[PDB]
């Protein structure tokens, strides 16, 4: 072979830090570790992939399987070369042949692919790619559309039963059987991760840590291999295995020899983990699971988990939950926010140290307005979390709810406490007109809990008009947590039903309180935790707050609030 290196298996603790130095100056210590691991491995003979009757069976002449671990198909008599398919056995942290790393089937290979799944008794396919990327084919669609209901490739009959469609992955529940062979059908689980770019990396490591938690959860009735394929089967797939394995390896020895495990992989299939970015990714995955761990109760076991999470037997100490809140970062000066700190703009902030990050501040097609873009459960949908308008910005405010096409506004504050103004009053009884836009409220409905106001907006661009709803919530001073939650909830429902839900930076919702973080964070949270409690019966309060804390400063910056989420999410699900 060659002269690689000898890296020191990282121990749990120092992981966080090792990572830090390994990445200083655009991580050359990493670019080195990954640079030394050879593309292919000279020795290991690759004679069967190259054969002539198998040329068309490969997706890239660049990626061909070693001969000793190549997955084999029941040699069809006569038809020479029917034992070959582009796939390869891969070893985990122990289980030899735990996975099958395979090239995305070709339209001409689709039948040999479902043959491998039947002959290998695999009942867990993990697709980490998209059939179409950049207008080029990266993988044929080897499955029936929920419509066709059932399609049979060759002698293998595939029928889909369920089709769940989450934010990053789509989980399908199939039933396959060989009808030319009296034997009974098998339940297959197919996951497709769509938030992963070819040769690239996802957005947040937690996304990867995410589907891992969920493939480990799927049932493998035949102790068969786990099919992990992508386009060539080496890049994104190699990376996934990396994490899965190295995690076991951590949850096992509190150490991790990534370098080693990659080299070990690169010995079974060429170019596995094809990018420095994916290399650095695997580490981050470990550094973050290590750091914050697994925070994601299931609606099934919510009340149990939370109940003990809240108790601290030796009271001279905090509760486990408190532990959690403390592990939660607080990006204090996390990123650039100069825009918000200009001379004229410092008088455009109800609060000087609650300025939007330059990285997400709402442009004012550009001018300034203290409002932050917030990520929504369903990507790429986004909502604005701004501050109650200032007696002088009331004009800009409407420009924003008009330009970004807001449909519903949620005001969590009163117009003013005692004598001091907590917010201005962007609305009047008349036909208030701010700059190019003209508002005109048409209705004002007061309820024991909130108050709905229906405005009709326009410009000199008349004979059109957009109707804008505003829900103002009362029972909730910037202090006491929402008085009686059960109704805070009802609000969130009625509000939700007025916004569409069809899925152009045109954010439909807009939420605000004094600084747009104080109590606006609690809201945004609840929103996503609810939309997830519905679509997956699962809930990760920690991570949700971690992305908020990351979006604008000031949100859920107190244990009282953090814990609040837990409470409400729970009482509204027995």
């Amino acid at each position: 072979e060659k002269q690689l290196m000898n890296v020191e298996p990282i121990h749990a603790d120092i992981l966080l830090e090792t990572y830090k130095r390994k990445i200083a100056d655009e991580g050359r210590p990493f670019l080195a570790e990954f640079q030394s691991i050879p593309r292919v491995f000279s020795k290991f003979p690759i004679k069967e992939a190259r054969k002539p009757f198998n040329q068309n069976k490969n997706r890239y002449v660049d990626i061909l399987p070693y001969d000793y671990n190549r997955v084999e198909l029941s040699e069809i008599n006569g038809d020479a070369g029917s034992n070959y398919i582009n796939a390869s056995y891969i070893d985990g942290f122990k289980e030899p042949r735990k996975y099958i790393a395979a090239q995305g089937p070709r339209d001409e290979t689709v039948d040999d692919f479902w043959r491998m799944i039947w002959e290998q008794k695999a009942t867990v396919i993990v697709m980490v790619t998209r059939c179409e990327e950049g207008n080029r084919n990266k993988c044929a669609e080897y499955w029936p559309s929920m419509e066709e209901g059932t399609r049979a490739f060759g002698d293998v009959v595939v029928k889909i039963n369920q089709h769940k469609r989450c934010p990053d992955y789509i989980i399908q529940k199939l039933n396959i059987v060989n009808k030319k062979e009296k034997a009974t059908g098998r339940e297959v689980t197919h996951i497709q991760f769509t938030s992963w770019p070819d040769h690239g990396v996802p957005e947040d490591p937690h996304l990867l840590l995410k589907l891992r938690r969920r493939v480990n959860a799927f049932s493998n009735f035949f102790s068969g291999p786990i099919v992990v394929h992508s386009s060539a089967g080496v890049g994104r797939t190699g990376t996934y295995i990396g994490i899965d394995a190295m995690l076991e390896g951590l949850e096992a020895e509190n150490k991790v020899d990534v370098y080693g495990y990659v080299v070990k992989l690169r010995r079974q299939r060429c170019l596995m983990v094809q990018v420095e970015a994916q290399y650095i990714l695997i580490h981050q995955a470990l550094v973050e699971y290590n750091q914050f761990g697994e925070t994601e109760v299931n609606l099934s076991e919510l009340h149990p988990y939370l109940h003990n999470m809240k108790k601290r037997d030796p009271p001279s100490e905090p509760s486990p939950l408190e532990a959690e809140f403390q592990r939660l970062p607080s990006y204090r000066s996390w990123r650039t926010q100069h825009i918000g700190n200009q001379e004229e703009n410092k008088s455009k902030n109800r609060n000087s140290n609650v300025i939007p990050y330059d990285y997400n501040r709402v442009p004012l097609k550009s001018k300034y307005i203290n409002a932050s873009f917030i990520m929504s459960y369903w990507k790429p949908e986004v909502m604005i979390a701004a501050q109650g308008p200032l007696k002088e910005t009331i004009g800009d405010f409407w420009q924003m709810i008009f330009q970004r096409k807001v449909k519903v506004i949620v005001m969590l504050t009163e117009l003013k406490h005692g004598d001091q103004e907590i917010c201005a009053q962007y609305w009047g009884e008349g036909k208030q007109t701010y700059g190019d836009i003209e508002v005109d409220l048409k209705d004002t409905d007061k309820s024991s809990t909130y108050t709905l106001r229906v405005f009709e907006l326009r410009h000199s661009k008349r004979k059109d008009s957009r109707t804008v709803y505003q829900y103002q919530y009362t029972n909730w001073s910037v202090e006491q947590l929402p008085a009686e939650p059960k109704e805070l909830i009802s609000m969130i429902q009625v509000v939700k039903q007025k916004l569409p839900q069809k899925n152009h930076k045109s954010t439909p919702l807009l939420i605000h309180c004094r600084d747009g973080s104080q109590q606006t964070g609690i809201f945004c949270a609840l929103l996503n935790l609810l939309e997830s409690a519905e679509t997956e019966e699962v809930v990760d309060i920690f991570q949700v707050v971690k992305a908020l804390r990351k979006a604008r400063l000031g949100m859920v910056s107190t244990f009282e609030q953090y814990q609040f989420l837990y409470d409400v999410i729970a009482s509204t699900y027995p």
Binding site: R39, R59, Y60, V61, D62, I63, S231, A232, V234, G235, L271, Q274
Partner: peptide
Amino acid sequence: REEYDV
């Protein structure tokens, strides 16, 4: 043809 890694 078509080289994966490019």
